Amino acid sequence: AQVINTFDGVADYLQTYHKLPDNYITKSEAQALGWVASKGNLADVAPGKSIGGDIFSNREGKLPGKSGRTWREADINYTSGFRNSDRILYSSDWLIYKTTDHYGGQIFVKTLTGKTITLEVEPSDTIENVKAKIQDKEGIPPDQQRLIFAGKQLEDGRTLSDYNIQKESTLHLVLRLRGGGQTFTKIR
């Protein structure tokens, strides 16, 4: 088969045919074949395939937004091993963007009701930015959010990497009732 997996090649193909090349499979298709996120076994169970076609939420607004416009992503320059940091982003109206610094992936967050949600994050995300994403996706105000990981409370100002949180890690929301709005701290 002819693998199209470059920024330029996938971009042109997407623009010409309005679909991904044949070497792309969705995460669920990959999961069905045995791919386990974080194990780097995609090419073992699906030689010559790359992950692509799934919804990209754009919760940080870094891509141009518009009513009715949704975004999808696909892996770029992948052959085998762990997925890399290259992605192409394409909209329902066929705008095309690229990133070479997508170092993140999904984590899980266990809410107070018992429900567990998934959230796309980067290791460089600050804690206060993660709380905003939880608000954006689940509707929980940041002032009701207290996040624990492996016995340690996640503090505003720090990043996920400060706690070695990574793909597939699980965060735990714990009860916070004191409410409150914005708070300020003196910088001496």
Swiss-Prot record:
<protein>
    <recommendedName>
        <fullName>Ribonuclease</fullName>
        <ecNumber>3.1.27.-</ecNumber>
    </recommendedName>
</protein>
<comment type="similarity">
    <text>Belongs to the ribonuclease N1/T1 family.</text>
</comment>
<feature type="active site" description="Proton donor">
    <location>
        <position position="102"/>
    </location>
</feature>
<keyword id="KW-0540">Nuclease</keyword>
<dbReference type="GO" id="GO:0005576">
    <property type="term" value="C:extracellular region"/>
</dbReference>
<comment type="function">
    <text>Hydrolyzes phosphodiester bonds in RNA, poly- and oligoribonucleotides resulting in 3'-nucleoside monophosphates via 2',3'-cyclophosphate intermediates.</text>
</comment>
<dbReference type="GO" id="GO:0003723">
    <property type="term" value="F:RNA binding"/>
</dbReference>
<keyword id="KW-0378">Hydrolase</keyword>
<feature type="active site" description="Proton acceptor">
    <location>
        <position position="73"/>
    </location>
</feature>
<keyword id="KW-0255">Endonuclease</keyword>
<keyword id="KW-0732">Signal</keyword>
<keyword id="KW-0964">Secreted</keyword>
<keyword id="KW-0308">Genetically modified food</keyword>
<dbReference type="GO" id="GO:0004521">
    <property type="term" value="F:RNA endonuclease activity"/>
</dbReference>
